[PDB]
Amino acid sequence: MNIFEMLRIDEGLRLKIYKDTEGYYTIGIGHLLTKSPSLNAAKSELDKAIGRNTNGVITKDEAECLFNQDVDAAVRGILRNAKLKPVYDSLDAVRRAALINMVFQMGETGVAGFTNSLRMLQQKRWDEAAVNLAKSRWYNQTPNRAKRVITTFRTGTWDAYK
Numbered sequence: 001m002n003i004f005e006m007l008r009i010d011e012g013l014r015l016k017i018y019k020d021t022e023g024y025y026t027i028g029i030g031h032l033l034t035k036s037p038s039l040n041a042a043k044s045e046l047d048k049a050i051g052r053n054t055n056g057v058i059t060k061d062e063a064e065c066l067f068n069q070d071v072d073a074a075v076r077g078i079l080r081n082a083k084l085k086p087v088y089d090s091l092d093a094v095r096r097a098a099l100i101n102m103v104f105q106m107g108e109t110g111v112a113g114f115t116n117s118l119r120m121l122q123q124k125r126w127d128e129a130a131v132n133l134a135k136s137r138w139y140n141q142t143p144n145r146a147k148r149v150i151t152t153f154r155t156g157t158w159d160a161y162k
């Protein structure tokens with residue numbers, strides 16, 4: 001198990017434009033296209049991201065291309081952020097993947113707002129962090145995915161994904 005397989009489980013794979021849990025236009029492996037309600041705006045972003053006239057449908061290779069770019073962007077967003085980098089540096093390899101997962105889903109600014117959870121993770125207070133992480137809109141809106149990520153933070157194992 002690794003971060004690519006983990007996010008592939010959490011995000012799924014769809015080759016046609018769809019709406020995510022929030023109603024935003026998305027494609028591939030959780031690649032957010034736009035938060036605008038216009039399908040034409042989403043098709044325009046898609047063509048721009050892929051470099052061709054797609055008409056809303058991409059191939060599996062194109063979906064994995066965006067996926068690689070998005071995982072790379074998430075990791076580099078963590079390392080550039082003054083609040084996230086110290087937490088990431090303090091974590092073991094499995095818990096680092098859990099932090100990448102969160103950044104992938106809600107963005108670098110959103111995760112950096114979990115000020116109290118991040119401090120508990122840095123102090124390695126795993127049970128207390130898990131309780132604090134669940135007191136969030138994130139947990140209430142996507143509870144099954146949040147539980148898997150929180151369990152990864154709590155245990156340091158991949159057991160939630162087996």
Ligand SMILES: *SCC1=CC(C)(C)N(O)C1(C)C
Binds near residue numbers: 064065
């Ligand atoms: S993101 C790299 C990528 C993969 C593939 C689908 C082969 N592509 O057209 C590019 C080179 C963009």
Ligand SMILES: [Cl-]
Binds near residue numbers: 049
């Ligand atoms: Cl992009």
Ligand SMILES: [Cl-]
Binds near residue numbers: 142143144146
């Ligand atoms: Cl869920």
